[PDB]
Amino acid sequence: FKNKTVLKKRCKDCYLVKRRGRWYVYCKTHPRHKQRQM
Amino acid sequence: SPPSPPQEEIGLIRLLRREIAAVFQDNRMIAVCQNVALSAEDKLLMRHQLRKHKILMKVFPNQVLKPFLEDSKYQNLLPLFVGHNMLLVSEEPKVKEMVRILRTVPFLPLLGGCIDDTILSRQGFINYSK
Amino acid sequence: SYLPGYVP
Amino acid sequence: AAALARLGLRPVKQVRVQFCPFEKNVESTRTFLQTVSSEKVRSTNLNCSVIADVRHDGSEPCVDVLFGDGHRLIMRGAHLTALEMLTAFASHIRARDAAGS
Amino acid sequence: ALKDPDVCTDPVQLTTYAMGVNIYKEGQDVPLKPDAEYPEWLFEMNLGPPKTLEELDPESREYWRRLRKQNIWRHNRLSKNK
Amino acid sequence: EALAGAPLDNAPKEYPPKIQQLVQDIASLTLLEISDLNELLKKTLK
Amino acid sequence: VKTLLPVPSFEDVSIPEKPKLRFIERAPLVPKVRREPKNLSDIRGPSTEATEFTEGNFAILALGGGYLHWGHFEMMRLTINRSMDPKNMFAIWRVPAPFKPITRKSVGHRMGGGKGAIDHYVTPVKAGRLVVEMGGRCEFEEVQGFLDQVAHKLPFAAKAVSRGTLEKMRKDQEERERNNQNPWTFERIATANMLGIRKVLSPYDLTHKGKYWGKFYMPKRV
Amino acid sequence: FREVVETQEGKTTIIEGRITATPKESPNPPNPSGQCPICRWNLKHKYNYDDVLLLSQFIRPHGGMLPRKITGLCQEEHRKIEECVKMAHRAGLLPNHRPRLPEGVVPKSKPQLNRYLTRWAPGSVKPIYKKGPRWNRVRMPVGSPLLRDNVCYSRTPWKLYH
Amino acid sequence: GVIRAIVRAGLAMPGPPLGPVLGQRGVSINQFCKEFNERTKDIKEGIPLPTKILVKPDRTFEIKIGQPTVSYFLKAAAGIEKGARQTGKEVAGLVTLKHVYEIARIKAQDEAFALQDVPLSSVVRSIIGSARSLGIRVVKDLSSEELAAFQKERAIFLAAQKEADLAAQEEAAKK
RNA sequence: CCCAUAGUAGGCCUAAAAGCAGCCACCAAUUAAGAAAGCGUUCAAGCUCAACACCCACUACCUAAAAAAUCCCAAACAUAUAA
Ligand SMILES: [K+]
Ligand SMILES: [Mg+2]
Ligand SMILES: [Mg+2]
Ligand SMILES: [Mg+2]
Ligand SMILES: [Mg+2]
Ligand SMILES: [Mg+2]
Ligand SMILES: [Mg+2]
Ligand SMILES: [Mg+2]
Ligand SMILES: [Zn+2]
């Protein structure tokens, strides 16, 4: 997870999900694509 | 909401409407198989083995073929056209050849059609062949 | 049995 | 296709799809046939035979699946969506895969 | 070291024989037949630039085949920057 | 104007009504008339 | 049968010989000796120059006032030239090179002792001015991406526009004023000195009409 | 509606679907010109989170919302009911639409806190440890901004932030 | 899987680029060279033949050899050795419609065109398309005198091109 | 979401340039698929996108944060007729 003010999907396997009141980018193919809304 | 002016029919639809009429008028056997998802090679090969007996393989969208059949005499062929549908049309009934080529693929279903202006089923063709 | 302005 | 192909047809001995094409309730079963008959799904297991039976007796469509373990799955598509049948089909594949091994 | 076999350079032969049609060592050059021995559609082929959308008939497959290619070209142009 | 659907595979054999008239017409005719008809039929079919 | 539509044609379009943006100098060739007053009004209010399209069909539209120093020009030039297709696209500057001298005093100095020495040059810009104009055999969607990237990096609010979107912008603002249901408008109250309001307004507000505050442009104000 | 029954007999599973009784819309809507169930019955801007008789018609047996394509609601009303159902669940007004629990699962006792007009999910909200000044006070949202246009019978408008 | 590359008739060698690909996938390079050279023994050496090597899971290879590439057929029928460096601006060759028709008859037997059961008209339209990319101009009728004139002019143009290339190469040496 | 065969590895340059280092063309087979829009390969393979078929995705096309030092800081409240 890297904090980001603007969330961007970096590959086709990235998916946006809202959990615990904030938006996250999750990616199983490339875990480095994981992002947390700042 | 005010309806929108009906969109004018596209020139391709007219050409498809005319090719369908011709295929339906200038042929005798008009089988209707389900265009299963065979590989490109297998589809091409099976289409060449049918062409050995000059059994053409047509493919028309179900949005042009349906309107035509609705207003045409073949009003009972509609139920068949729910999904992918290829036509196996020949100018002279060559059912036995088609049937043996169609039996090489166990999962390709022959749904029916109309030979000599007579709407048949699958067993009808298997009977017309014998 | 519902008028033009009836509201449930 | 791709979703089912990812699971594979390793524990499926035979799949038989019986429908009456002239009937008006076979759309779901025919869509199921299109998915299972895909080159990708079939390529997963070449020993599994997909058999499509076309009948005009007027009976309701049915899908019979025979697994290697000997258990069978009968799905009646008269009042079932293609997605529902495929979902149930995949679940049984997962169950029969762990049992055999 | 690998290249094609030597090509002919005789105007008489190149205009009276199809040099590369015969690929077998034991075969002979293919003599060009007279004009009357070729089908009519051969001499009606479009030897110039491709017909434009305006020239094509809106009720022919060629017209819509040309429009689909132009749309793919446009989609590629728009997608390049995206 | 709309051809009839295909009969069920298990349903009893059904013959079109238009031929039912032809079946009866043949019985009424005489053999000598049927014979003359046959001579022209055989040649016409060849 | 997916319905195709005719694609736009750019056969009549012609690409200049020099499609890329030219180099902008830090300072004028002849250095200015006379130091000038600050004159902040040169970035205040609506723009009167370079508000319309000339050669191209796409541009970056200023939505505020600000000064463009050489660093900004390099950002604009390198970004557009690197991103544009020289064969099918051309770009021109719609702003002059930095010409207004900015003075700076020595670090650590006290107030007084005369004006500071000239340090660098800037280009004043007003809201509504086109900053860079692009054209060629392309659509707005092709250049909108990198033009918006440049607009975000400018020292004032800016947005990539086209001949169509710019005209739609102006038409929408005119329609909002015509269909506005508020019986009270800033223009009416200010020009009639209703409530003695001009005691808290600037003489410029008679023409700005509440749409401009300092260097900031308020597009939702009617 | 359509059900699905799974029966395992003789080491064989049979999957079947049956059509059960389906409810029908009441006859003679007061506003036939309406384009969705809400405006056909003049209910726009006239329902709240506690109108479970209305809300319960658009949810699944386990509390889930129904698709907009099936119910026919418009995007605007479909979103309003969506928020209203979340608030109804959180208020405890739908005790017979609880989530499905797998066999052998019994939730552990949790502290009971009565609440209503709950916009957010309890677990996703942090305490307001620093309230801030009066001119920049951090407020606690109450209700939903989607219902801001509901008919107001008082002279004071709905306060959505406490 | 299927390995598809153009291999010249009778000149298969264990070197790159086909060799490494065959080795990486487990197929023996020497065996293929022997089999291909034997089955391409009746074809003039140096003819580019598109080959399709079907590799089975046990690393036994089947080769499917087709008709020569249309680039060869058009180059040989024109008497040219290399295609145009800027097609559409320079005419590198000149053939007649009769030449294209004769090429279509042989190319129509290829499995790509044969399996589609397309009329010879479709194959001729395809060959004309490839010719427009080689710089070869298709004309309805060509005389022996007209071909000599073009060959004379083409030789001059090609000679100047060599001089220009030499200048660039010589300039690069001075750099 | 679904799906992908083919003249052909277009020619040129290049040790190699095979849709995808560059230059030129950008025609054509199949009902349908750019001489290729994005990745990838030393070059190839390989994964997508634009195609067909299937068929109501029946898309919004406005953007978007936070940290300080003694101890948060009125209490509270969505519902009864504008006064
Ligand atoms: K900015
Ligand atoms: Mg095509
Ligand atoms: Mg190709
Ligand atoms: Mg090449
Ligand atoms: Mg290339
Ligand atoms: Mg490829
Ligand atoms: Mg490359
Ligand atoms: Mg696609
Ligand atoms: Zn990713």
| Cα distance between residue G197 and residue G190, in whole Å | 6
CATH of region B1-130, choose from 3.90.25.10, 3.40.50.800, 3.40.50.1000, 3.30.70.1730: 3.30.70.1730
Give residue limits of the domains in chain G.
18-222
Smallest CA-to-CA distance from A26 within G183, I5, A10 is with: A10
| Cα distance between residue B24 and residue B69, in whole Å | 10
Smallest CA-to-CA distance from H87 within H125, H132, H122, H46 is with: H122
Using an 8 Å CB-CB cutoff, list chain D residues near F9: 55-57
Smallest CA-to-CA distance from D15 within D55, D47, D56, D54 is with: D47
* Record: contact F3-B121, CB cut-off 8 A: no
Query: DSSP alpha helices (H): ranges in chain D?
Result: 2-7, 27-36, 39-44, 82-100
Q: Which two tokens stand for residue G135?
A: 């054209």
**E24 has a chain I CB within 8 A of its CB:** yes
Smallest CA-to-CA distance from I133 within I85, I80, I101 is with: I85
Q: Which two tokens stand for residue E51?
A: 């017909």
Letter string b/e over residues I78-87, b meaning 16 or more CB atoms within 10 A of that residue's CB: bbbeebbeee
Smallest CA-to-CA distance from H28 within H42, H17, H14 is with: H42
Smallest CA-to-CA distance from C1 within H37, H28, H24, H23 is with: H28
Q: Which nucleotides of J are covered by protein (CB under 7 A)?
A: 2-13, 16, 18, 23-38, 42-46, 48-56, 58, 60, 64-65, 67-68, 72-74, 76-82
The count of other CB atoms within 10 Å of the CB of residue D93 is 19
Longest dimension (CA), chain I: 59
- Asked whether strand J has any atom less than 7 Å from the CB of D39, the reply is yes
From chain D residues 31-90, the ones with a CB under 8 A of any chain F CB are 55-58
Distance from CA of I109 to the nearest CA of B (A): 14
Q: Residue B5 has what DSSP assignment?
A: P
Angle between helices B95-103 and B122-129 (to 10 degrees): 120
Cβ–Cβ < 8 Å for D43, D56: no
List the domain range (segments joined by +) for residue H150: 1-162
* Ligand 2 centre distance from Cα of residue B130 (Å): 40
H98-106's contacts with Cβ under 8 Å and 24+ in sequence apart are H98/H62, H98/H63, H99/H62, H99/H63, H100/H62
Q: Which two tokens stand for residue I147?
A: 């071909």
Continuous segment of H or E residues that includes residue B64? none
The count of other CB atoms within 10 Å of the CB of residue C1 is 6
Q: Residue G46 has what DSSP assignment?
A: B
Q: Which two tokens stand for residue E70?
A: 């132009």
F13-16's contacts with Cβ under 8 Å and 24+ in sequence apart are none
To test the contact with chain E by mutation, choose from I43, I65, I99, I122 the residue with the greatest count of E C-beta atoms within 10 A, namely: I99
* Amino acid type, D84: E
A15-19, strands of its sheet edge to edge = A2-4, A35-37, A22-26, A15-19
| Cα distance between residue B56 and residue G69, in whole Å | 72
User: Which domains does chain D possess?
Assistant: 12-95 (3.40.30.10)
Give residue limits of the domains in chain I.
1-66, 67-140
* Amino acid type, I91: V
Three-state DSSP string of chain I: CEEEEEEECCCCCCCCCHHHHHHHHCCCHHHHHHHHHHHCCCECCCCEEEEEEEECCCCCEEEEECCCCHHHHHHHHHCCCCCCCCECCECCEEEEHHHHHHHHHHHCCCHHHHCCCCCHHHHHHHHHHHHHHHCEEEECCCCHHHHHHHHHHHHHHHHHHHHHHHHHHHHHHHC
* Record: contact I42-E21, CB cut-off 8 A: no
- Asked whether strand J has any atom less than 7 Å from the CB of B41, the reply is yes
D40: nt with nearest C1' to CA? J3
Cβ–Cβ < 8 Å for E65, E71: no
Q: How many residues does chain B have?
A: 130
Classify G77 as helix, strand or coil.
helix
- Angle at CA of residue H129, ends H125 and H130, nearest 5°: 120
B110-114, strands of its sheet edge to edge = B56-59, B85-90, B29-34, B110-114, B119-120
Question: What method was applied to determine this entry?
Answer: cryo-EM
- Angle at CA of residue G78, ends G73 and G82, nearest 5°: 150
| Cα distance between residue G216 and residue G155, in whole Å | 12
Residues 6+ apart with CB under 8 A from I3: I18, I21, I22, I25, I27, I52, I53, I55
Residues 6+ apart with CB under 8 A from H134: none
* Amino acid type, H65: M
| Cα distance between residue H96 and residue H55, in whole Å | 13
Q: Residue G1 has what DSSP assignment?
A: -
Quickly name the fold that domain I67-140 has.
Answer: Arc Repressor Mutant, subunit A (1.10.10)
Classify G174 as helix, strand or coil.
helix
Distance from CA of F3 to the nearest CA of D (A): 15
Per the rule left: phi > 0, alpha: psi between -120 and 50, beta: everything else, H104 is: left
List, as one string, the DSSP characters of E6-62: PPP--HHHHHHEETTT--BTT---EEPPPGGGS-GGGGGS--SSPPPTTTS-TTSHH
Is the peptide bond preceding residue E58 cis, with omega within 30 degrees of 0? no
Distance from CA of E82 to the nearest CA of I (A): 30
Interface of H with A (CB under 8 A): 120-121, 123-126
| Cα distance between residue D35 and residue I101, in whole Å | 44
**B12 has a chain E CB within 8 A of its CB:** yes
| Nearest-10 Cα torsion for I128, I130, I134, I139 | 0
Handedness of CA G126, G127, G129, G133 (dihedral sign): positive
Q: Which two tokens stand for residue E72?
A: 């793919």
Q: How many domains does chain H have?
A: 1
**Domain I1-66 falls under CATH 3.90.1150.10:** no
